[PDB]
Nucleic acid binder design. Structure first.
Ligand SMILES: [Mg+2]
Ligand SMILES: [Mg+2]
Ligand SMILES: [Mg+2]
Ligand SMILES: [Mg+2]
Ligand SMILES: [Mg+2]
Ligand SMILES: [Mg+2]
Ligand SMILES: [Mg+2]
Ligand SMILES: [Mg+2]
Ligand SMILES: [Mg+2]
Lengths: 77, 119, 176, 136, 48, 79
RNA sequence: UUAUUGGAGGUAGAGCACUGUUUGGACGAGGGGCCGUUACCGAAUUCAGACAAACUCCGAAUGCCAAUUAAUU
RNA sequence: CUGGGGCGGUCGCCUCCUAAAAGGUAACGGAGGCGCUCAAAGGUUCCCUCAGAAUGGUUGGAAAUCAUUCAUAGAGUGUAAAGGCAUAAGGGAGCUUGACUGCGAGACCUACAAGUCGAGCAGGGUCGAAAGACGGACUUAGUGAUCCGGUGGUUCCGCAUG
RNA sequence: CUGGUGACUAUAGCAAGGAGGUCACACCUGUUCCCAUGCCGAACACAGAAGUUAAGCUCCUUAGCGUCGAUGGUAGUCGAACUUACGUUCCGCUAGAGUAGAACGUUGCCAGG
């Protein structure tokens, strides 16, 4: 690739918080949070509300509402 | 489904366009270069008669060895220059074969120049 | 390169066994991914095209090529040479990263998602997916999105048939 | 009234009329045909007159084909002008007919009916004609 | 191009060449290298 | 009343061959005046800015086939 | 002048490959009135048949330019 | 000029047909263009190949942009037509100013005056590794004699001499 | 026989079917280096040799398309005689279309086998 034209690119771990499922891939989201990975190096983490392993269409199961959500507050009521 | 182009065919179209304007004479024969994924070949051709005068390839046992392709191109240039000088040829026109004048082709040409072929 | 490793290990073997290829060189692979955004309203406001280019660059990771009108059209008020689109070509590791990201992080963010069209094959082993909201992609913050616009993602494969392309994309994990 | 929907040139040199029929000299669509034996210009109006005569006699029973078409515009000067000052305006449209050309063809009727229909047609045309059958 | 132009050598001043330019496209005094016979060399000429 | 809007034509340019196949010509002789390359320059023949074909050497004119559809003219020195 | 040999060139004729003109069919990507099926199929394709100074896939007779050319003049 | 004259039209230049397969060839015959444009739309080096259709794809529809396949030229070539051009004369980029100075064997055209083509030599350059290409533009219109006057240059003259 | 590089109006091409891979040609593995992409190491360039004949490429078969193509006859026509007839006759030349048929190349130089 040419130098100085492309946006900054780096490895990141997308973490589906619903299932606490982590997947490594490149992106340019540059989250401050850092986490360790099975390889010795550590890369920043991108929080993700819904993912392939959590979406109902992909999974075949009903999705689980997250904490502090609308459903949780409604049930607390 | 996406096709893959034939690099040699593209190369040959370019070479034909080069050769409309570039041709080799008995006094100033054409130094032609052919390049493969592994080897590089050089000929000296008189186009009026359609006869080769000298030949040298990186695939030849005399030149064949373990070296980078650019070093092998240098060796082929030196060899073809020496054989042309032995046959009594100084002035030639360099036919880059439709390849860009760069890298291996360029190294071969510069080797021939240094070996004493006058372009 | 998790997706590339999956292709090398599992998808290759599955597809080869399914289609009885005498040689490994017959195994289809995803040649490239072209992400195109056609901005016809750039005729009226070039800033829209600039924003589209910025968003596409953020999504893809590399600077897009600006595509200009091939011919002049009176009805669209389009003059030849006016930039009316953006396009990015992804190959290799960047392509695979974008593909897995699209499959996993991006696609499920579609409201009322029910899978992607299984008939969106050109007829020769290439698949075109029409996304309708840039906001799908994780790299874009809805605050900075002045306008919402879609994209065409063309996955160009070496498969000679729609059946083989479908098998390859399914093994990769494409919903349908 | 036949005439081309358009032409590139409205003012054209008048066609050569010597020689023999270049083509279309055989019955190829119907069973019977009307063959020109002398040379003439044939106008759109003459074609229409002849077609009406033969079709009316055939009483819609059979099928008619017009094998000639008036491609060629011809001009005429306005009345009472001197020579010169440019070529005149298009007056009509004509097909050139030479000996051997089939003018009309008919099918779907008896030979006798075809003969009478084509006789009635021939009296509308400025050329001599003969009744012809498909050759073999 | 829509106006005639005289190019004068910027070293000796000789008006060596005439040419043409579009005045709306090139409102400035155009300059270019041209051969100067008096000096027997290429010099920068510019529109008078 | 009546007039023609026609009545114009440009001067004829005397194009075509100016020397015959087999004829001896001196260097510089025009061999063929043309628009475009209806005929191509062959050996020892040049093509001027207006497509005129002219001889570069003294010699014999020869009109020759050039491939399947094209043709050229060449000039060859006499022994 | 003739004989022989070479060459330039697009006419006569012819043809429809291009640009246009044009007659009968076949078939129909697709939607509409129609339930699937009895218009338009205006698209595309295809068969057969025609027209052209400013059409040409072809192409004469002649005429023309030449030849260390022969005969007659 | 004029199928009497007037009135109308026309008057120079380019392309095509008429034009009878070299060239030339008329009419108040049939059709159109010109009185420019471009600082790149010129030079050179390197690279590239179209129009259209089918099938998929969002805003996008018959046509915008993307992708594959087919597609030999139906595109493009500043501008009329014709002849050419896909070994490009078409398209893109880098560097450039040969859109040079002195000329010019030979040739076309031709009543004259003019008009056109031109290898090659010398000087000093541009691009190219080099061979080499370049004295504008794919080609053919885009123009006006002399006299007189203006401006710049000039180892020319200067009415006894300076 | 294979390759490189030439010559020849496709009789050489297209299409379809089949065969091949110490070496060679490829696809192929990568982007440190020279070099590159109006984005993309796709391409160009370079480094390299794990994999594959799948494709390219080469070779073999054929006559579906394209190409070539008579003889015979016809159109046209130079010249001559007669004629005024949208003409006739005689002589020479002689198409286009179509038919038979040809054809899935022929060859020069160089280096390897
Ligand atoms: Mg003319
Ligand atoms: Mg010129
Ligand atoms: Mg004719
Ligand atoms: Mg009178
Ligand atoms: Mg003549
Ligand atoms: Mg003529
Ligand atoms: Mg141009
Ligand atoms: Mg004095
Ligand atoms: Mg024949």
């Amino acid at each position: 690739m040419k130098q100085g034209i492309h946006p900054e690119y780096h490895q990141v771990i997308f973490l589906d918080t619903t299932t606490n499922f982590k997947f490594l891939s490149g992106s340019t989201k540059t989250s401050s949070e850092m986490m360790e990975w099975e390889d010795g190096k550590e890369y920043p983490v991108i929080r993700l509300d819904i993912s392939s392993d959590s979406h109902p269409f992909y999974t075949g199961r009903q999705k689980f509402a997250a904490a502090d959500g609308r459903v949780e507050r409604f049930n607390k009521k | 489904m996406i096709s893959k182009i034939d690099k040699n065919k593209v190369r040959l179209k370019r070479h034909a366009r080069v050769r409309t304007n570039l041709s080799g004479t008995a006094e100033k024969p054409r130094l032609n270069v052919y390049r493969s994924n592994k080897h590089i070949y050089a000929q000296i051709i008189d186009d009026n008669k359609g006869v080769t005068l000298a030949q040298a390839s990186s695939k030849d046992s005399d030149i064949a060895t373990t070296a980078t392709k650019v070093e092998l191109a240098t060796k082929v240039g030196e060899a073809i220059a020496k054989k042309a000088a032995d046959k009594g040829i100084k002035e030639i026109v360099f036919d880059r074969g439709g390849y860009l004048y760069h890298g291996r082709v360029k190294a071969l040409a510069e080797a021939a120049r240094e070996s004493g072929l006058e372009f | 390169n998790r997706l590339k490793e999956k292709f090398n290990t599992e998808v290759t073997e599955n597809l080869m066994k399914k289609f009885n290829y005498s040689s490994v060189m017959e195994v289809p692979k995803i040649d490239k991914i072209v992400v195109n955004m056609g901005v016809g309203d750039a005729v009226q406001n070039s800033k829209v095209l600039d924003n589209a280019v910025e968003e596409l660059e953020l999504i893809t990771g590399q600077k897009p090529l600006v595509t200009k009108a091939k011919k002049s059209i009176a009805t669209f008020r389009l003059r030849e040479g006016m930039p009316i689109g953006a396009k990015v070509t992804l190959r290799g590791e960047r392509m695979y990263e974008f593909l897995d990201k699209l499959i996993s992080v991006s696609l499920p963010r579609v409201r009322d998602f029910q899978g992607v069209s299984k008939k969106a094959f050109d007829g020769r082993g290439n698949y075109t997916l029409g996304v309708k909201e840039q906001l799908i992609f994780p790299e874009i913050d809805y605050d900075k999105v002045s306008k919402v616009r879609g994209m065409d993602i063309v996955i160009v494969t070496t498969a000679n048939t729609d059946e083989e392309a479908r098998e390859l994309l399914a093994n990769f994990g494409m919903p349908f | 009234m036949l005439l081309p929907k358009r032409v590139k040139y409205r003012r054209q040199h008048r066609p050569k009329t010597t020689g023999r029929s270049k083509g279309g000299n055989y019955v190829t669509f119907g069973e019977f045909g009307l063959q020109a034996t002398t040379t003439s210009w044939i106008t759109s109006r003459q074609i229409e007159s002849a077609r009406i005569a033969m079709t009316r006699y055939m009483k819609r029973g059979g099928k008619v084909w017009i094998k000639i078409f008036p491609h060629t515009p011809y001009t005429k000067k306005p009345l009472e002008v001197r020579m010169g000052a440019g070529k005149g305006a298009v007056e009509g449209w004509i097909a050139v007919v030479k000996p051997g050309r089939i003018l009309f063809e008919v099918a779907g009727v008896s030979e006798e009916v075809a003969r009478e229909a084509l006789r009635l047609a021939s009296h509308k045309l400025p050329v001599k004609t003969k009744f012809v059958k498909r050759e073999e | 191009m829509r106006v005639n132009v005289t190019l004068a050598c910027t070293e000796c001043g000789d008006r060596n060449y005439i040419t043409t330019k579009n005045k709306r496209n090139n409102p400035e005094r155009i300059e270019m290298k041209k051969y100067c016979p008096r000096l027997n060399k290429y010099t920068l000429h510019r529109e008078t | 009343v009546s007039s023609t809007k026609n009545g114009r034509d440009s001067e004829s340019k005397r194009l075509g061959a100016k020397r015959a196949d087999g004829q001896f010509v001196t260097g510089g002789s025009i061999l063929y005046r043309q628009r475009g390359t209806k005929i191509y320059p062959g050996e020892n023949v040049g093509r001027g800015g207006d497509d005129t074909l002219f001889a570069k050497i003294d010699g014999v004119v020869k009109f020759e086939r050039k491939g399947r559809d094209k043709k050229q003219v060449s000039v060859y020195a006499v022994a």
